[PDB]
Design an enzyme around this catalytic site. Structure first.
Site, PDB file in Angstrom:
ATOM      1  N   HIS A   1       0.791  -1.231   0.000  1.00 49.27           N
ATOM      2  CA  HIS A   1       0.000   0.000   0.000  1.00 49.27           C
ATOM      3  C   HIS A   1       0.819   1.274   0.000  1.00 49.27           C
ATOM      4  CE1 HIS A   1       0.344  -0.057   4.439  1.00 49.27           C
ATOM      5  NE2 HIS A   1       0.024  -1.334   4.321  1.00 49.27           N
TER       6      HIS A   1
ATOM      7  N   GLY B   1       1.548   3.620  -3.058  1.00 51.33           N
ATOM      8  CA  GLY B   1       0.622   4.601  -3.556  1.00 51.33           C
ATOM      9  C   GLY B   1      -0.025   5.450  -2.486  1.00 51.33           C
ATOM     10  N   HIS B   2       0.423   5.330  -1.243  1.00 51.33           N
ATOM     11  CA  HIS B   2      -0.215   6.055  -0.154  1.00 51.33           C
ATOM     12  C   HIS B   2       0.774   6.496   0.941  1.00 51.33           C
ATOM     13  CE1 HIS B   2      -2.945   6.984   3.190  1.00 51.33           C
ATOM     14  NE2 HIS B   2      -3.955   7.001   2.337  1.00 51.33           N
ATOM     15  N   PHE B   3       1.649   7.438   0.603  1.00 56.38           N
ATOM     16  CA  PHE B   3       1.627   8.108  -0.676  1.00 56.38           C
ATOM     17  C   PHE B   3       3.004   8.066  -1.208  1.00 56.38           C
ATOM     18  CE2 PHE B   3      -2.483   9.781  -0.681  1.00 56.38           C
ATOM     19  CZ  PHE B   3      -2.793   9.984   0.675  1.00 56.38           C
TER      20      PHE B   3
ATOM     21  N   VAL C   1       2.263   7.100   4.491  1.00 56.73           N
ATOM     22  CA  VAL C   1       1.487   7.159   5.728  1.00 56.73           C
ATOM     23  C   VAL C   1       0.366   6.122   5.703  1.00 56.73           C
ATOM     24  CG1 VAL C   1       0.149   9.065   4.738  1.00 56.73           C
ATOM     25  CG2 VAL C   1       0.122   8.624   7.268  1.00 56.73           C
TER      26      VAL C   1
END
Lengths: 144, 142, 142, 142, 144, 142
Positions: A46, A49-51, A56
C-alpha cells in the site's frame, strides 16, 4: 492470558496477503477483550501509492486491523475458524487522531460489547506507544 | 456538469497504485456533489487475499473509494491538488448492505454537508445498479 | 441463456491473478456464442507500467480476454474444466481500433466458427458501449 | 552492429514494469532487422497465475516481446523516443508452436517489411535455442 | 544523537520498494555507530513465498537491512546521498542464530570499523528484544 | 547427470514467488555438486526498487540463489522435500566481483564440502558467461 502467532491466526482468519493486517493477538481474554499487534513497515504494498514519497498508513487499514483482531478472538472463542468468513456490517464513531508511519507499532485494543448469533460488535482503540491514534466501534457478522 | 478521467484525477489525488480506488468522477457540481466511478474486476491485488477462491470487495476499500471521490472534488474546487495530501479524520454511520464482486460497477454518490478551513465532511452512498450497497459519512482534513 | 460469475469461471479456467482477464460470461449459448465481461480499472498491476502516468489497456490483454471467454464456454460445454489447460495456437486478423481506459467496460462477443478434437477457433470482437474497440480470430487447443 | 541494454531501451520504450518485455536488443541493423532478448524466469509476476504450479509463458506476452523489439529499433532509427508512445494496430499470422518455460531464453528476430508515416509493420519470429517457438506479423503506429 | 525517519532515509538511500529494508535509523553517532529499525509484518511481499503458510524472514534480507543502515549513516556523514548508489562487495562471518517472524522488531546495531575512499566496512549485529538474532561483517563501496 | 526443471524444483524447495530464485538445476551429481540456473530479466519485482532507472541485481539475492541450488540438491538427495524447510545459518567469504543485469544468465556452481544431520555447508561461485561474478561459502540446516 492466551496469545496467537501469525500461523495460528491463519486458522481463524481467512484473510491472506495483501489483506492480513494483524501480525499477532495477545492478552486474549476469552471473547471479551484482546490486543492485536501490527508492525508498520515501509516494505508493504500500500505504501507504493499512499503516498508516493510520503508513506502514511491509510486509516481504513487501521480499521481493518481492528476488525481482524476482534473477528479473530471471536472465531477462536466460538469454535469457528476460516471456511466460515466474516462480513463487515457497520463502523461507527471512527475517529483518527494521529498519523502512523513506517517504524510504528500498532496495538489494537478491542473490547467485547456483543457477540451472539454470528454477529459481534466491538469497541476498538488503536495505540502507538500508549498514545491513542485511532478509535472505532466495529460490527460484523459471520457466515458459514 | 464536469467530469474527470483517471489522468486528470491523478492531478488532484496524490494516491497511486495500489490505493487509487476511483477510476472516474462525473456529474461534478462544483464542490457540493459528485459521483465517483470504480469498476470492480478480479484482476486487482486485494482479491488475492480477500478472499482466496472467494473474491469479494472489502468494505473498507469501498469507504476509501467514497473518501477519494469526495476529496477529489474538494481538491478540484479549492484550487488544490496533490502535493497537499488529505488526512482522513472520521467515519460515521458506515453501513454495508450488500457484498460487491468482480464485474460490478460501483458508483459513489457524494454530497457536500461541509468544506471549510482544509476540512470537509461528506454524506456518501455507494450503489451498484441503482441498488444502495453501502453508505457512510466521511470527514477528512488537508 | 446461461451465465457464469467469477467463482464459477474459476472452475473452467485454470488462469489466476494476475492473468485471469474476464470477470463474467453472459448470454452463453451452448458453445456457439457468448459475451465475456471485463471491467477496466486503474487498480490493475499492468497499469503500473503501461503506461506510467498514462494508463491504457494493452491490446494483447484484450486478445487474452477474448481467448479466455471463448475457452471458457468451450470448457463448460464439453464437460471439461481446468486441470485440462488450454494452449493458444493462432491469432489472425487482429485489429485494434480504439484505446480503452480505466472506467471502461469491455464486452467480448465471441462466435463459434469451430470446436472439435480439443481445438476450437472463434471470431471475437471487443466492444465498449456498442463501439467496436477491437477484433480478432483466435484459435486454441486443449 | 548496434546493441542496446535495458537502461538504453528505457529511453526508446515508454513501457515499464510489469510490462517491459525485452531485456536487450542486439544485431540492430538500422531499422530493418534486429534481435530482441528476453530471459524467462520464474520470478515474474504473470507466473503467479499462468499457471499456478505450472508456469508457462503466455503467448500474448511473446507477441508483446516481439512488438517491443520492433517498436524499439524503429524508435531508435527515427530519432524518436518514449514521450511519443506506440499503439499496436494489427497482428496477423500469429502462430505458437512450442511452449516456453522458466530457464528459457527468447530471441525475437524481427525484419522490417515497412516503416513510414509513424506506422511500421514487421515480420517476427521467436526462437529458443535455434528452435522456432512462435511467429507473427505485427503492425503498429506512433 | 541523530535520528532519521523513512522520508529522510529516502534522501540518502536510493533503494525503494520492495527493497527498502529499514524503516528508521536512530542513535546515529556521526559515522561510527547507529541502530537501524525494521518492523517485520506479515504484509510484506517476500512472505508470499518464504514460506507459504509459514512466514519466516529471509536471512539475506536481514543482511540487506544491516547493510542499508550502515550505508545510510555513511551517506549522511559524508555529505553524500542517493544519485551516488552503493555496491555491496563483501559479507563475512555472517551468522544466523534465531528465526524472526511477523510481529518482531529488528534493531540493527552497526559499528564503524572503516569508512574511507568510497568504501566502508561495518560490524553489524541484529537483535529482537535484546536477543542477538544475527550478525555479519559487511563491506560496500560507493560510486558516483 | 540429473537435472530438474522449475516444476520439479517446486517439490524440493518450499520457496515460491517472489523468492524462488533458481529456474533450473543441472549437472546434478548426487549431493556433491550441481549447477543452478537463474535468468535475470527486467520483469522481476525487485528491479522496481533496486534501482529505479538503474536495475542491477542485489548481491544478497545472488547469495540466496546459490543457497537455493545447494539446498535443492540436498533435498533431492536426502529423500527430503518441502514440508521440511531450510534455515540459513552462515554465510562466509562472500565476495561480489561484478554487477549483473537484465539479460544476464547466472549459473550457480555449488560444491559439497559437508551434508550430515540436517546441516549442509557448500562452496558456491556464481558465473555469467564463464566469468566469476560472485562467490560464497553458505551453510544451512533443515
Amino acid at each position: 492470558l492466551d496469545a496467537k502467532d501469525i500461523v495460528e491466526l491463519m486458522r481463524f482468519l481467512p484473510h491472506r496477503y495483501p489483506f492480513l493486517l494483524v501480525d499477532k493477538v495477545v492478552n486474549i481474554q476469552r471473547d471479551e477483550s484482546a490486543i492485536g499487534i501490527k508492525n508498520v513497515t515501509f516494505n508493504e504494498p500500500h505504501f507504493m501509492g499512499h503516498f508516493p514519497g510520503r508513506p502514511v498508513m491509510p486509516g481504513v487499514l487501521i480499521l481493518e486491523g481492528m476488525a481482524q483482531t476482534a473477528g479473530a478472538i471471536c472465531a477462536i472463542h466460538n469454535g469457528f475458524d476460516q471456511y466460515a468468513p466474516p462480513y463487515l456490517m457497520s463502523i461507527d464513531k471512527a475517529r483518527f487522531r494521529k498519523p502512523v508511519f513506517p517504524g510504528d507499532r500498532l496495538e489494537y485494543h478491542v473490547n467485547k460489547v456483543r457477540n451472539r448469533v454470528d454477529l459481534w460488535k466491538f469497541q476498538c482503540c488503536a495505540k502507538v506507544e500508549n498514545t491513542v491514534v485511532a478509535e472505532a466501534e466495529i460490527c460484523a457478522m459471520v457466515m458459514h
